[PDB]
């Protein structure tokens, strides 16, 4: 019956592919062909924060559009004031192998993880002054690659042992566990209403989970290599992935298929980060070629570059009001564009 | 009115960060690799995600990193150890896959100028086995006498023939685990590597 079940799975995959392809009557580029282009958009460096000493692996924006948190492999995590370049906090870590960081929406907690398979929570509003460790979650057998807050009580983490879990910072116990991927899960993104999230595994696929039920709903397979970044459209109806095949793609949740592909002949290096614009017209991507290419999301064409980095770009982000964009790199430098 | 105090606090924490970095710049880092049950435990004990061991020998603060617990693809986390001073390799004579691991490690993109220290252990067991069984089973192509010294030289030459970059050197020493001379070998190799790196940095090399 094993061969029969394999044949049934193959025929189900064929049916799914036929159904997905039967709904593609037209193309996005055809419909957005009669729209004036955005033109040239050159951005100039305004500020430059230089506090770290090693490669920067993650960054995040506060909900106030003023405070930012940076995590570097020197064993430290700082909190920046972007309007003044002043430093507010400096938290020493226990394990120097850090690969992720997060900022609570309320502004009271931060999170950190890495090669130690343990995710930490820090309290920033202590009565006695300094910052103390509030929790230490440990349930993963593989390196943790991403962690994103839901509220002040719960957090969702993605690990390298092909599993995703939803925790509870009050007790430190796994409420739910998501399984099904084949390789390492290296990316995560949460919906605007924080009821759904997507992840990108290393077996060249991406799935759409849901927090309440702990199940999977759809899978999008259209890439050629591993997936290292993911982000959500501001309307929460689409998400754009960035792989190591030097191509970024746009997937539609309702259409259950890809819509447009952003690539060019010259680009060879893979993509390490991806981010959208607040109104959804631009799409900035970070490249291993030390540059950042600003794309016109509705026309699949370039609109400018962001030069000024001496090494690979590791992280990029846009504020909540869309007034600024910040990038980090392996040379221990962060720049604020405008 | 009160932003000057915030500026003072920022300057103070920046100074503390600089002092911490200056203090931490002095350490020497060594990566530790090898196959499963290859005797790495014997060497680390002779003096869950990752295990770190530190000890001091002649005013030098070593740090050994063990990554044997990471049962994942090595291409996803190998860039974190790009700045290691050297790589220690252990090989069990009394036993193919080690050749593939050595080939993969030596020709990595991030390790094009990193020296490798090779340790050959279980020499006594290899001698007893060669007194009992020949060396032609493990190497069907090897031709010549069935002596211990010739077999050891052939194995070392086979291991060394996997390096192509002229800018890196491989140090080889034969161990029997009934000794405490590993620290001196590591010290000498590290001193030579440090001298070479210092000379290359200044521009006379």
């Amino acid at each position, epitope marked *: 019956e094993l061969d029969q079940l394999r044949q049934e799975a193959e025929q189900l995959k064929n049916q799914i592919r036929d159904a997905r392809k039967a709904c593609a009557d037209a193309t996005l580029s055809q419909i957005t062909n009669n729209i004036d282009p955005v033109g040239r958009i050159q951005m100039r460096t305004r500020r430059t924060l230089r506090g770290h000493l090693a490669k920067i692996y993650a960054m995040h924006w506060g909900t106030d559009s003023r*405070l930012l948190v940076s995590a570097s492999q020197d064993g430290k995590l700082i909190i920046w*004031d972007s309007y003044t370049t*002043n430093k*507010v906090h400096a938290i020493p870590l226990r394990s120097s192998w850090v690969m992720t960081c997060a900022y609570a929406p309320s502004g009271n907690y931060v999170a950190c993880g890495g090669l130690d398979n343990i995710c930490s929570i820090y309290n920033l509003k202590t*009565r*006695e*002054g*300094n910052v103390r460790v509030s929790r230490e979650l440990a349930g993963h057998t593989g390196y943790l690659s991403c962690c994103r807050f839901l509220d002040d009580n719960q957090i969702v983490t993605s690990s390298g042992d092909t599993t995703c879990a939803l925790w509870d910072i009050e007790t430190g116990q796994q409420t739910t566990t998501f399984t099904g991927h084949t390789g390492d899960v290296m990316s995560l993104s949460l919906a605007p209403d924080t009821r759904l999230f997507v992840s990108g595994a290393c077996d060249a696929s991406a799935k759409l989970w849901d927090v309440r039920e702990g199940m999977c709903r759809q899978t999008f397979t259209g890439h050629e290599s591993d997936i290292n970044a993911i982000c959500f459209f501001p309307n929460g109806n689409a998400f754009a992935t960035g792989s190591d095949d030097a191509t970024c793609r746009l997937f539609d949740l309702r259409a259950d298929q890809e819509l447009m592909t952003y690539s060019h002949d010259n680009i060879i290096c893979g993509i390490t980060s991806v981010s959208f614009s607040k109104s959804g017209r631009l799409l900035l991507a970070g490249y291993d070629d030390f540059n950042c290419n600003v794309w016109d999301a509705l026309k699949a064409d370039r609109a400018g570059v962001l030069a000024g980095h001496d090494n690979r770009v590791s992280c990029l982000g846009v504020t909540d009001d869309g007034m600024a964009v910040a990038t980090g790199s392996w040379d221990s430098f962060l720049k604020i564009w405008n | *009115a*009160e*932003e000057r*105090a*915030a500026l*003072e*606090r920022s300057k*103070a924490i920046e100074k503390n960060l600089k002092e911490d970095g200056i203090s931490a710049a002095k350490d020497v880092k060594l990566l530790l690799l090898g196959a499963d049950n290859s005797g790495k435990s014997t060497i680390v004990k002779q003096m869950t995600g990752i295990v770190e061991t530190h000890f001091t020998f002649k005013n030098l603060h070593f740090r050994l990193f063990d990554v044997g617990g990471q049962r994942s693809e090595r291409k996803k986390w190998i860039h974190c150890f790009e700045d290691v001073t050297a790589i220690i390799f252990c090989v069990d004579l009394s036993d193919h896959e080690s050749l593939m691991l050595f080939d993969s490690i030596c020709n990595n993109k991030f390790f094009i100028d990193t020296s490798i220290i090779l340790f050959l252990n279980k020499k006594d067991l290899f001698g007893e086995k060669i007194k009992k069984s020949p060396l032609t089973i493990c190497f069907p192509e090897y031709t010549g006498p069935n002596t211990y010294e010739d077999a050891a030289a052939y194995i070392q030459a086979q291991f060394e023939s996997k390096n192509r970059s002229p800018n890196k050197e491989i140090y080889c020493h034969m161990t029997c685990a009934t000794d405490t001379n590993n620290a001196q070998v590591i010290f000498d190799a590290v001193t030579d590597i440090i001298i070479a790196n210092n000379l290359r940095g200044c521009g006379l090399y």
Partner: single-chain antibody
Framework: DVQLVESGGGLVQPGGSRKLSCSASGFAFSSFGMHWVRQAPEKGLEWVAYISSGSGTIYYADTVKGRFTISRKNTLFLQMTSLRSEDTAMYYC??????????????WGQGTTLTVSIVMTQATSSVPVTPGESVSISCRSSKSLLHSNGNTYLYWFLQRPGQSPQLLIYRMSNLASGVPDRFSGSGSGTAFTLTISRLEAEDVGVYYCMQHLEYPLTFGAGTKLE
């Protein structure tokens, strides 16, 4: 539990000297700034001295410069010399931390009774009030309290009878930690007011208002809601 104990006061003849101490525990003493606030037995509060975090910067009042000295183990000192008859007042120990989003003047001390042998105006000095009603107190300022960055510095304190003052509203709009939701504050430039909703028997005392723009810190006369 955060504690700040001070002692060392007593009867002194004129022309003498005395040493005051402020022992602190329960918090990171090395990352805070310390103040000194006195209150005459029949008058309002008055600023005395300030020492920054790390002894970097020190400030003194107008009528104590050259005669007092502030130093900071986990203990703070205050050396006073040439004690005249106008220094008879209890001295409090006040902590404050300064960074983006901090709340200075958080926790006050207990005070030591020492016995010796911008013009910010609060027009109203006494109001008649009964439980269950709503009361409001207002105090003005001689100079505008809005800086270029958009921040206004008005603080409101409450001193229950026989107790120490506790911070209620900082920067004219922000409610402190632990304060009930009844209190609220508003103002514009030079005229400020505070509102109390559903007054009970646990909110009876005297109120003070204070600025934090010019470091010669100045309080108000004070209003007693009896």
């Amino acid at each position: 539990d955060v504690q700040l104990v001070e002692s060392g006061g007593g009867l002194v003849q004129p022309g003498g000297s005395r040493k005051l101490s402020c022992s602190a525990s329960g918090f990171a003493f090395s990352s805070f700034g310390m103040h000194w606030v006195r209150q005459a037995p029949e008058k309002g509060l008055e600023w005395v001295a300030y020492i920054s975090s790390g002894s970097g910067t020190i400030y003194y009042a107008d009528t104590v410069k050259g005669r007092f000295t502030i130093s900071r183990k986990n203990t703070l000192f205050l050396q006073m010399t040439s004690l005249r008859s106008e220094d008879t007042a209890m001295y409090y120990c006040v902590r404050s931390i300064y960074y983006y989003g901090s709340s200075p003047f958080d926790f006050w001390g207990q005070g030591t009774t020492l016995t010796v042998s911008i013009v910010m105006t609060q027009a109203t000095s006494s109001v008649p009030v009964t439980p269950g009603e709503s009361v409001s107190i207002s105090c003005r300022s001689s100079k505008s309290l809005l800086h270029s960055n958009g921040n206004t510095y008005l603080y409101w304190f409450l001193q229950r009878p026989g107790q120490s003052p506790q911070l209620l509203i900082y920067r004219m709009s922000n409610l402190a930690s632990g304060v009930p939701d009844r209190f609220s504050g508003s103002g514009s430039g030079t005229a400020f007011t505070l509102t109390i909703s559903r007054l009970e028997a646990e909110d009876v005392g005297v109120y003070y208002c204070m600025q934090h723009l010019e470091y010669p810190l100045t309080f108000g006369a004070g209003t007693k809601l009896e």
